[PDB]
């Protein structure tokens, strides 16, 4: 069927600037295209239809343009209430199809993450589990990669990395990584390291602890 | 042919305007010196008494110089010494001459016979409803006859189009629609589409199932479907409208199709494979519908009356467009710059000469309307200046005069550059 | 009159292979005059159109996505402005937020008003309360780890709501039919351990409300 391809999953911008969100159709759909906006926890809301017709009540800042396959949604003078997801939709042929969405990310200066590591608690070791946690707080941009080398050996297995969305107060990101092991495996090694590689530092920031020292 | 057609069109238009100015001026005992056509260095000039005619290089505009326009010259032939009302008449001569020219050429075209599609005059019968459109959504079955919208009572498709464009310009959204079928006037609440930007009501007129052309290299051309032949059925399906043939081809989606063609009195079961064209993954048959047109020739007096009515309607539409633009209803990108004039003139010229003439009439009317707005260094601003002087009884202050002229020159220049870059933007797409 | 309003009901947790009916209550507009649809929005994935139904003048005909034809059924109530959607043979891939929507009257169906949506979770996992473990070692960062619970959601506060600055609550992660979530807080070193810091975790699906004070360890 008809596939709506939004090449960008994320787009960076500042308040007062202009943003161009692109949308590519699998085949010719003419102008039978609509655009929607969805804020976190709220329902989508139609802004433009027929490529260029603004819906009633939509401010003049939202403009649509394009014909054929390379439709574009331009947002002139970006306001703060526009941090949301924007996606296209075609109704030239059935089935109706949507785009994957485009999230608006706010620009700000770079920031190195604050890394903290935590060993398993006595309660969990008593329960038969052993989780080691690494917090990476208040970094920018969101791109980061974490390795759990233990005593020099890779431990790709047992990682459950998780990322938050952009903070609504300082426009930064945070991430938590939990390495879950069995009690037998936790007691067979010494040093635990959460080396963090980020673009703000040519060499990765390293934080580690040894169970033998405690 | 296109560029020279644009050049001659702009030349005859500016010549008509400046000739109206010049004749009105000569009918009031004034001396004209400069008859410059366009701008730039004058390419060539010929002298005849006081009236020195010249033609210049760059034909974008055009202006005329008189004797004693604003100079403190007390000679009777000086334009300044003339009464304000005569000066107002001189100012109005240009647009008035343009309007007269437009009416005359419109009447001449009507008398010579205009070629219009036949469906534009037949009664409004909905021969085909576009799928899941406003007409279908409200419940307009095929074969229903529309008799009224809002509002303008409609009898012809042209009337329906005119009513729709007027309603779109007026910014009406919900419209009463009196539709007739089997003697039932079923009032409906239609939604007026913004026909200015392209969207339509999804109503199609009856079209006969006959082919007027075939693309060379198309599979239909290889099968042997020559243009000008009618088609009876498709795979035995009873079809009485060309749009139904279009629907059958659309639903074929590449399946082998057996067209029962009535080849001028004989039946041929032509076999075709209109597969999914790799250009768009769509059915391809490379056919052309047989458009039907009729030539109309109104009586000379009736043709003149119709031309007057059409001129009034077009003037009303242009005034409404201007009002919408000044209120932000219509974007600034719809303005027609000189390069757009050139491209549309070339399109009309390659289309023919009668379409060239009617487009010349329309653009002349547009120029006449545009030159009437109150604006310094425009054929409308001096009317305001002289009216102010007449009502107050004294001339405008000279420093204020210089300020007015300078700001007018600046605004005209900047708007010309803005429409120029708009023309380049249009050329880009 | 009242403005356009749509309210969905019928969501929740349902075991695989079951059946249920979702409902959409509408108000503020003539119900029989507009197309209705059941476009769905899965978590963190693109929208998937499911079906739509035409108006009264068009015979109330329906159109379906080919993947769900014979499985999903859309319909309207006979005497009320209520839209229904019957769903059977539920699988884990059907877990999503299901949106009811009113469409405009323009050319070709687009959706001019959306409901709040109702969330459906299809799984065989048993509801399980969480286990909360503290993680203890200028500005110092503490946190609480909630592990081994089902289903969502779980709410976390710090110091009964009085500690809100510097709180990062991370989205839950699923593993072996059990979720894991973590929360972090950053306090000045001059404020801990001189004053107590306790995290409170609520899991209404099992009527669980645990308080866990974070005390420092040996390392
Ligand atoms: Zn003039």
Following DSSP, what letter does each residue of B341-388 receive, concatenated?
Answer: HHHHHHHHHHH-SHHHHHHHHHHHHHHHHHTTSS-TTSTTHHHHHHHH
Closest in B139, B193, B202 to C58, CB measured:
B139
Domain final residue pick, A76, A106, A136 = A106
CA A87 to chain centre: 16
A43 bridge partner residues: none
CA C133 to chain centre: 26
Number of domains in chain A: 2
Breaks in chain A after residues (C–N exceeding 2.5 Å)? none
Among residues A30, A5, A22, A14, the alpha carbon closest in space to that of A78 is found at A14
Residue whose pair of structure tokens reads 């334009």 in the numeric block: B79
Q: How many whole angstroms separate alpha carbon B264 and alpha carbon B280?
A: 34
**Between β-strands C62-64 and C51-53, what pairing exists: parallel, antiparallel or unpaired?**
antiparallel
Among residues A71, A4, A94, A82, the alpha carbon closest in space to that of C46 is found at A4
C51 bridge partner residues: C64
User: With contacts defined as CB-CB under 8 Å, which chain C residues touch A163?
Assistant: 170-171
Among residues B252, B247, B250, the alpha carbon closest in space to that of B271 is found at B252
User: With contacts defined as CB-CB under 8 Å, which chain C residues touch A119?
Assistant: 135, 217, 219
Q: Do A114 and C170 touch (CB under 8 A)?
A: no
Q: How many whole angstroms separate alpha carbon B410 and alpha carbon C1?
A: 52
| Cβ–Cβ under 8 Å, residues A194 and A118 | no
> CB within 8 A of B347, min separation 6: which ones?
B2
Residue whose pair of structure tokens reads 């406003």 in the numeric block: B134
Angle at A36 between CA A35 and CA A39, to 5 degrees: 155
Q: How many whole angstroms separate alpha carbon B17 and alpha carbon B31?
A: 18
Q: How far is the CA of B92 from the centre of ligand 1 (A)?
A: 9
Q: How many whole angstroms separate alpha carbon C2 and alpha carbon C28?
A: 5
Resolution (A): 3.6
A76 shares its domain with A120: no
Q: How many whole angstroms separate alpha carbon B39 and alpha carbon B304?
A: 36
Q: How many whole angstroms separate alpha carbon B104 and alpha carbon B364?
A: 12
Q: Decide: helix, strand or coil at residue B321.
A: helix
Task: Please give, one letter per residue, the 3-state secondary structure of C48-70.
Answer: ECCEEECCHHHCCCEEECCCCCC
Q: What is the DSSP letter of B69?
A: S
- In a mutational test of the C interface, the residue from B131, B136, B137 whose CB has the highest number of chain C CBs within 10 Å is B137
Helix (H) or strand (E) holding B126: strand B126-129
User: With contacts defined as CB-CB under 8 Å, which chain C residues touch A180?
Assistant: 175, 180
Among residues C68, C69, C35, C28, the alpha carbon closest in space to that of C52 is found at C35
**Cα(first)–Cα(last) distance of chain B, in Å?**
22
Domain ranges of chain B: 2-28+82-112+347-428, 119-150+152-204, 211-290
A18 shares its domain with A90: yes
In B377-416, the residues whose Cβ lies within 8 Å of chain A are none
CA C191 to chain centre: 37
Q: Decide: helix, strand or coil at residue A98.
A: strand
A58 shares its domain with A25: yes
- Look up the domain containing A150 and give its range: 114-213
Among residues C21, C20, C23, the alpha carbon closest in space to that of C6 is found at C23
Q: Do B194 and A53 touch (CB under 8 A)?
A: yes
Q: Do C57 and B139 touch (CB under 8 A)?
A: yes
- In degrees and rounded to multiples of 5, residue A208 shows phi and psi of -155, 165
B125 bridge partner residues: B145
Q: How many whole angstroms separate alpha carbon A102 and alpha carbon A100?
A: 7
Q: Is A125 exposed, middle or buried (CB count within 10 Å of its CB: 0-12, 13-18, 19+)?
A: middle
Breaks in chain C after residues (C–N exceeding 2.5 Å)? 137
**Edge-to-edge strand ranges of the sheet holding A114-118:** A114-118, A129-139, A173-182, A162-163
Q: Is B204 exposed, middle or buried (CB count within 10 Å of its CB: 0-12, 13-18, 19+)?
A: buried
Among residues A76, A115, A128, A93, the alpha carbon closest in space to that of A4 is found at A93
Q: How many whole angstroms separate alpha carbon B296 and alpha carbon B110?
A: 8
Q: How many whole angstroms separate alpha carbon A27 and alpha carbon A90?
A: 11
**Edge-to-edge strand ranges of the sheet holding B32-35:** B44-48, B51-55, B32-35, B65-66
Helix (H) or strand (E) holding A148: none
Q: Which two tokens stand for residue C219?
A: 């390392």
Residue of chain A nearest C112, judged by CA positions: A46
> CB within 8 A of B344, min separation 6: which ones?
B336, B359, B363
Q: How many whole angstroms separate alpha carbon B228 and alpha carbon B217?
A: 17
Helix (H) or strand (E) holding B244: helix B242-252
CA distances to B298, B310, B346, B364 from B108, in Å: 10, 13, 22, 15
Q: What is the DSSP letter of B139?
A: T
CA distances to B169, B171, B320 from B195, in Å: 9, 11, 15
A80 shares its domain with A137: no
Other beta carbons within 10 angstroms of residue B126's beta carbon come to: 21
User: With contacts defined as CB-CB under 8 Å, which chain C residues touch A99?
Assistant: 46
> CB within 8 A of B376, min separation 6: which ones?
B404, B405, B407, B408, B409, B411
Residue of chain B nearest C103, judged by CA positions: B137
* Peptide bond preceding A141 in cis form (omega within 30 of 0): yes
Other beta carbons within 10 angstroms of residue B316's beta carbon come to: 12
Assess whether the region B119-150+152-204 and the region B211-290 belong to the same CATH fold: yes
Q: How many whole angstroms separate alpha carbon C196 and alpha carbon C219?
A: 19
- In a mutational test of the A interface, the residue from C69, C119, C135, C141 whose CB has the highest number of chain A CBs within 10 Å is C135
Task: Please spell the DSSP secondary structure of chain C, one letter per residue.
Answer: -PPPEEEEE--EEE-TT--EEEEEEEESS-GGGS-EE--EE-TTS--B--EEE--GGGTT-EEE-TTTTTTEEEEE-SSSSEEEEEE-S--GGG-EEE--EEE-SSSS--EEEE---EEEEE--PPPB--EEEE----EEEEEEEEEEEBSS--EEEEGGGT--TTEEEPPPEEETTEEEEEEEEEEETTSTTTS--EEEEEEGGGTEEEEEE------
Q: How many whole angstroms separate alpha carbon C48 and alpha carbon B289?
A: 38
Q: Which two tokens stand for residue B370?
A: 């545009």
* Peptide bond preceding B101 in cis form (omega within 30 of 0): no
Q: Collect all residues from B whose CB is shorter than 8 A from any CB in C.
A: 130, 132-134, 136-139, 191, 193, 199-200, 202
Q: Which experiment gave this structure?
A: cryo-EM
**Cα(first)–Cα(last) distance of chain A, in Å?**
61
Other beta carbons within 10 angstroms of residue A209's beta carbon come to: 18
Residue whose pair of structure tokens reads 């012809």 in the numeric block: B156
CA B323 to chain centre: 18
Q: Tell me the torsion sign for CA atoms B163, B165, B170, B174.
A: positive
CB crowding C134-169: b at 16 or more within 10 Å, else e:
bbbeeebbbbbbbbbbbbeebebbbeeeebeeeebb
* Peptide bond preceding C151 in cis form (omega within 30 of 0): yes
Q: What dihedral do alpha carbons B162, B167, B168, B174 form, nearest 10°? A: -140
**Between β-strands C82-87 and C139-149, what pairing exists: parallel, antiparallel or unpaired?**
unpaired
Other beta carbons within 10 angstroms of residue A174's beta carbon come to: 22
Q: How many whole angstroms separate alpha carbon B357 and alpha carbon B202?
A: 31
C145 bridge partner residues: C133, C182
A90 shares its domain with A128: no
Determine the distance in angstroms separating the CA of C56 from the nearest CA of chain B, rounded to an integer. 9
**Between β-strands C36-37 and C51-53, what pairing exists: parallel, antiparallel or unpaired?**
antiparallel
Q: For domain B119-150+152-204, give the CATH superfamily.
A: PDZ domain (2.30.42.10)
| Cβ–Cβ under 8 Å, residues C31 and C15 | no
Q: Decide: helix, strand or coil at residue A115.
A: strand
Q: How many whole angstroms separate alpha carbon C42 and alpha carbon B420?
A: 49
**Between β-strands A10-13 and A102-106, what pairing exists: parallel, antiparallel or unpaired?**
parallel
Q: Tell me the torsion sign for CA atoms B369, B372, B373, B377.
A: positive
Residue whose pair of structure tokens reads 């009901």 in the numeric block: C9
Residue whose pair of structure tokens reads 């405690």 in the numeric block: A214
Q: What is the CATH number of domain C5-122?
A: 2.60.40.10
Q: How many whole angstroms separate alpha carbon C151 and alpha carbon A104?
A: 30
Q: Which two tokens stand for residue C142?
A: 């503490």
Beta strands in A15-122 (DSSP E): 19-22, 24-25, 33-38, 45-49, 53-54, 62-65, 72-75, 85-90, 97-98, 102-106, 114-118
Domain final residue pick, A106, A124, A144 = A106
Closest in C35, C55, C107 to B133, CB measured:
C107
User: With contacts defined as CB-CB under 8 Å, which chain A residues touch C117?
Assistant: 43
Q: For domain B211-290, give the CATH superfamily.
A: PDZ domain (2.30.42.10)
For position A119, which CATH number holds? 2.60.40.10
| Cβ–Cβ under 8 Å, residues C196 and C213 | yes
| Cβ–Cβ under 8 Å, residues B286 and B279 | no
A206 shares its domain with A188: yes
Decide if B47 touches A, using CB distance below 8 A.
no
CA distances to B20, B28, B99 from B23, in Å: 5, 9, 15
CA B111 to chain centre: 20
Q: Which two tokens stand for residue C174?
A: 């699923």
Domain final residue pick, A106, A134, A168 = A106
> CB within 8 A of B392, min separation 6: which ones?
none
Q: What dihedral do alpha carbons C161, C166, C167, C168 form, nearest 10°? A: 170
**Between β-strands A62-65 and A191-193, what pairing exists: parallel, antiparallel or unpaired?**
unpaired
- In degrees and rounded to multiples of 5, residue B167 shows phi and psi of -65, -40
Residue of chain C nearest B139, judged by CA positions: C57
A139 bridge partner residues: A173
Q: Is A188 exposed, middle or buried (CB count within 10 Å of its CB: 0-12, 13-18, 19+)?
A: exposed
Among residues A31, A33, A32, the alpha carbon closest in space to that of A6 is found at A33
Chains adjacent to A (≥3 CB pairs closer than 8 angstroms): B, C
| Cβ–Cβ under 8 Å, residues B307 and B110 | yes
Q: Which two tokens stand for residue B189?
A: 């609440």
User: With contacts defined as CB-CB under 8 Å, which chain B residues touch C57?
Assistant: 138-139
Q: How many whole angstroms separate alpha carbon C66 and alpha carbon A183?
A: 50
- In a mutational test of the B interface, the residue from A1, A26, A28, A32 whose CB has the highest number of chain B CBs within 10 Å is A28
Half-sphere exposure of C138 (CA within 13 A, CB side): 4
Q: Which two tokens stand for residue B292?
A: 């039907």
A156 shares its domain with A195: yes
Q: Do A27 and B198 touch (CB under 8 A)?
A: no
Q: What is the CATH number of domain C131-213?
A: 2.60.40.10
- In degrees and rounded to multiples of 5, residue B110 shows phi and psi of -65, -45
> CB within 8 A of B230, min separation 6: which ones?
B208, B209, B210, B211, B261, B262
For helices B398-428 and B381-392, the axis angle rounded to 10 degrees is 160
Q: Which two tokens stand for residue B155?
A: 């009898």
- In degrees and rounded to multiples of 5, residue C33 shows phi and psi of -105, -5
| Cβ–Cβ under 8 Å, residues B212 and B288 | yes
Q: Is C22 exposed, middle or buried (CB count within 10 Å of its CB: 0-12, 13-18, 19+)?
A: buried
User: With contacts defined as CB-CB under 8 Å, which chain C residues touch A94?
Assistant: 63
| Cβ–Cβ under 8 Å, residues B20 and B97 | yes
| Cβ–Cβ under 8 Å, residues C73 and C19 | no
Other beta carbons within 10 angstroms of residue B368's beta carbon come to: 25
Among residues A24, A29, A19, A22, the alpha carbon closest in space to that of A4 is found at A24
Q: Do C184 and A176 touch (CB under 8 A)?
A: yes
- In degrees and rounded to multiples of 5, residue C21 shows phi and psi of -130, 130
Q: How many whole angstroms separate alpha carbon B58 and alpha carbon B413?
A: 15
Residues of chain C with CATH 2.60.40.10: 5-122, 131-213
User: With contacts defined as CB-CB under 8 Å, which chain A residues touch B198?
Assistant: 31, 50
Q: Tell me the torsion sign for CA atoms A195, A200, A203, A206.
A: negative
Other beta carbons within 10 angstroms of residue B354's beta carbon come to: 15
For helices B354-370 and B338-351, the axis angle rounded to 10 degrees is 160
């Amino acid at each position: 069927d008809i596939v709506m391809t939004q090449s960008h999953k994320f787009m960076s911008t500042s308040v007062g600037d202009r943003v161009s969100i692109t949308c590519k159709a699998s085949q010719d759909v003419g102008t039978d295209v609509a655009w929607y906006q969805q804020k976190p926890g709220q329902s989508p809301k139609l802004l433009i239809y027929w490529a260029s017709i603004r819906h009633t009540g939509v401010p003049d800042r939202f403009t649509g343009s394009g014909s054929g396959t390379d439709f574009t949604l331009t947002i002139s003078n970006v306001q703060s209430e526009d941090l949301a997801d924007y996606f296209c939709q075609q109704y030239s042929s059935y089935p109706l199809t949507f785009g994957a969405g485009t999230k608006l990310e706010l620009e700000r200066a770079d920031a190195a993450p604050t890394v903290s590591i935590f060993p398993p608690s006595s309660e969990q070791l008593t329960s038969g589990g052993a989780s080691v946690v690494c917090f990476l707080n208040n970094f920018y941009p969101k791109d980061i990669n974490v390795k759990w080398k233990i005593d020099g050996s890779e431990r790709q297995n047992g990682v459950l990395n998780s990322w938050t969305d952009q903070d609504s107060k300082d426009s930064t990101y945070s991430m938590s990584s939990t390495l879950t092991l069995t009690k037998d495996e936790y007691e067979r090694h010494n040093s635990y390291t959460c080396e963090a590689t980020h673009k703000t530092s040519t060499s990765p920031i390293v934080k580690s602890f040894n169970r033998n020292e405690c | 042919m296109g560029l020279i057609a644009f050049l001659i069109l702009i030349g005859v238009l500016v010549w008509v305007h400046q000739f109206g100015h010049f004749l009105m001026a000569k009918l009031f005992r004034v001396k004209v010196e400069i008859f410059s056509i366009g701008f730039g260095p004058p390419i060539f000039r010929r002298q005849w008494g006081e009236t020195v005619y010249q033609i210049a290089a760059l034909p974008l505009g055009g202006y005329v110089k008189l004797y004693g326009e604003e100079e403190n010259v007390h000679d009777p032939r000086a334009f300044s010494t003339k009464k304000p009302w005569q000066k107002i008449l001189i100012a109005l001569g240009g647009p008035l001459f343009n309007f007269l020219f437009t009416i005359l050429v419109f009447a001449l075209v009507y008398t010579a016979g205009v070629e219009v599609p036949k469906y534009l005059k037949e009664p409004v019968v909905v021969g085909y409803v576009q799928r899941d459109s406003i007409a279908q959504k409200i419940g307009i079955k095929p074969g229903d006859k529309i008799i009224k919208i809002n509002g303008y009572e409609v009898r012809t498709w042209e009337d329906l189009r005119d009513a729709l464009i007027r309603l779109s310009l007026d910014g009406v959204k919900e419209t009463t629609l009196f539709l007739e079928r089997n003697g039932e006037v079923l009032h409906l609440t239609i939604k007026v589409p913004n026909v200015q930007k392209g969207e339509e009501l999804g109503i199609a007129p009856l079209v006969k199932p006959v082919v007027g052309g075939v693309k060379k290299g198309s599979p239909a051309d290889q099968v042997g479907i020559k243009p000008g032949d009618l088609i009876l059925e498709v795979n035995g399906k009873k079809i009485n409208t060309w749009y139904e043939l279009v629907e059958e081809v659309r639903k074929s989606q590449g399946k082998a199709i057996k067209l029962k063609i009535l080849r001028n009195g004989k039946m041929i079961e032509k076999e075709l494979i209109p597969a999914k064209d790799p250009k768009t993954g769509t059915y391809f048959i490379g056919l052309f519908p047989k458009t039907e047109t009729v030539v109309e020739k109104k009586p000379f007096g009736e043709a003149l009356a119709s031309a007057v009515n059409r001129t009034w309607e077009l003037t009303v539409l242009t005034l409404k467009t201007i009002a919408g633009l000044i209120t932000g209803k219509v974007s600034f990108q719809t303005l027609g710059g000189p390069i757009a004039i050139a491209q549309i003139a070339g399109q009309a010229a390659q289309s023919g000469f009668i379409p060239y003439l009617v487009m010349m009439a329309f653009i002349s009317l547009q120029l006449g309307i545009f030159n009437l707005i109150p604006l310094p260094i425009l054929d409308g601003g001096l009317i305001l200046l002289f009216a102010i002087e007449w009502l107050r009884g004294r001339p405008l202050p000279e420093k204020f005069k210089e300020y007015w002229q300078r700001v007018g020159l600046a605004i005209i220049i900047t708007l010309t550059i803005f429409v120029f870059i708009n023309d380049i933007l249009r050329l880009l797409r | 009159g009242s403005e356009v309003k749509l309210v969905e009901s019928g969501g929740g947790l349902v075991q695989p292979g079951g059946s249920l009916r979702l409902s959409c209550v509408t108000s503020g507009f003539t119900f029989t005059d507009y197309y209705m649809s059941w476009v769905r929005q899965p978590p963190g994935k693109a929208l998937e159109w499911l079906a739509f139904i035409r108006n009264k003048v068009n015979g109330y005909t329906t159109e379906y996505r080919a993947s769900v034809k014979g499985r999903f059924t859309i319909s309207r109530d006979s005497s009320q402005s209520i839209l229904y959607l019957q769903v059977n043979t539920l699988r884990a891939e059907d877990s999503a937020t299901y949106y009811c929507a009113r469409d405009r009257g323009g050319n070709g169906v687009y959706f001019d008003y959306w409901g709040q949506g109702t969330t459906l979770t299809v799984s065989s996992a048993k509801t399980t309360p969480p286990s909360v473990y503290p993680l203890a070692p200028s500005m110092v960062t503490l946190g609480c780890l909630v592990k081994g619970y089902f289903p969502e959601p779980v709410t976390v506060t710090w110091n009964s709501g009085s500690l809100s600055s510097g709180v990062h609550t991370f989205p839950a992660v699923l593993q072996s039919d059990l979720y894991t979530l973590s929360s972090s807080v950053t306090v000045p070193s001059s404020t801990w351990p001189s004053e107590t810091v306790t995290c409170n975790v609520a899991h209404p699906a099992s009527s669980t409300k645990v308080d866990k004070k974070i005390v420092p360890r040996d390392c």
